[PDB]
Symmetry: C2
Subunit: 228 residues, 2 copies
């Protein structure tokens, strides 16, 4: 029995202007936008309590998508960076009736190839975890550490090294506290796990598929064009 | 003035049989095989002394390629693993007149998108280096170290972490000694740098392009289909 969960998709920091080199979340992926496909990975999950997309209030692409006119997609205002956008997302979840002990999944807007199997794996492996955790994949490339002069100082043992993916799954109140405090503290937050780790907690790694990739170059798009 | 150099392409470990899921080096990349495109990255370099491809003696795909009937492409027998194939490559270079102090570049058969700019950068930055070195790219993904129970123990500082690419450039005699000794010693050799590092030496990292990617899934092929 998978746990109930909320989803937050931080998708803000889009200009007010359309640009010829579009934001990655609005690139075409086999006939639909990246972000539309990302939302498809969650919207029909039977345990989804609600999904919030964090958007610039003047985002010019969003109002043209059918997910902008969906009762199943709620909206929160973007922040100054990902953490503030996620924080606004959590406040929105509380308006929708979320409780402090509810699971929240935060997922990259530009990871449209999340499979139901990986989603369910994350939910089931963390449902009783003390902290939560994240999808991650084993590092397969050879990893070298550089010394001060740009020479190899060691080859890192990559059998203990994992690439951090999303979703990342944490309880609402705990994540809110960690993100808010880390911002005040001046921490260089990357993902939600980085805030939880700064707060002292050790997230659990859950192995996912390597092809749950993030679109960071319009060229990454090519890798996924046959995935749907 | 770029240094003179030999090239070794380890390309062995191909079965005697053709297979429906071809060896990656014989996949089609925009109308030519991967390995043909890889060879194109070296063959017309004015400082190339000679190029050796290490192949299974019964490789069924190679004899159908025009590079199998080229005076500019020499051949060496594959070994039991990459290091032994490279060692056979070095012996072939010596037959072609290579000297122990000549630079040798070893490059992955399935990295067909090496640019002349990266090749020249490697050659010029290492021409006077005491050891040699390798192309490499900064790690961009968030890297987590796992503890014994699969929880995050730390987020690795990735600003000192590099992904090892090829070519890797070392002097012939030194590389021969390192590879041969590392095999006898039972070292888990990955690339040439791993053998040189086992022998004590610190290769120099030379920054290359991230899209000099290795084709490891027929899906990686999609990323490069518009690169030529
Ligand atoms: K955001
Ligand atoms: K080989």
């Amino acid at each position: 029995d998978l746990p109930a969960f909320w989803t937050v998709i931080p998708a803000a920091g889009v200009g007010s202007r359309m640009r010829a080199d579009r934001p990655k979340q609005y690139l075409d992926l086999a006939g639909r936008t990246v972000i539309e496909r990302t939302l498809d990975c969650f919207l029909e999950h039977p345990m989804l309590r609600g999904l919030v997309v964090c958007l610039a209030e003047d985002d010019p692409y969003w109002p043209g998508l059918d997910c902008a006119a969906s009762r199943h997609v709620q909206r929160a205002a973007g922040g100054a960076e990902r953490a503030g956008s996620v924080l606004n997302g959590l406040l929105r979840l509380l308006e929708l009736g979320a409780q402090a002990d509810d699971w929240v999944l935060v997922h990259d807007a530009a990871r449209p190839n999340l499979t139901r199997g990986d989603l369910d794996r994350l939910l089931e492996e963390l449902a009783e975890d003390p902290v939560g955790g994240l999808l991650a994949v084993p590092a397969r490339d050879t990893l070298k550490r550089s010394d001060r002069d740009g020479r190899v100082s060691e080859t890192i043992d990559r059998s203990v090294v994992w690439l951090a993916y999303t979703p990342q799954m944490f309880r609402l109140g705990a994540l809110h506290r960690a993100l808010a405090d880390a911002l005040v503290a001046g921490v260089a937050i990357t993902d939600e796990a980085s805030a939880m780790e700064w707060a002292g907690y050790a997230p659990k790694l859950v192995e996912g598929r390597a092809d749950n990739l993030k679109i960071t170059t319009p060229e990454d798009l090519l890798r996924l064009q046959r995935s749907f």
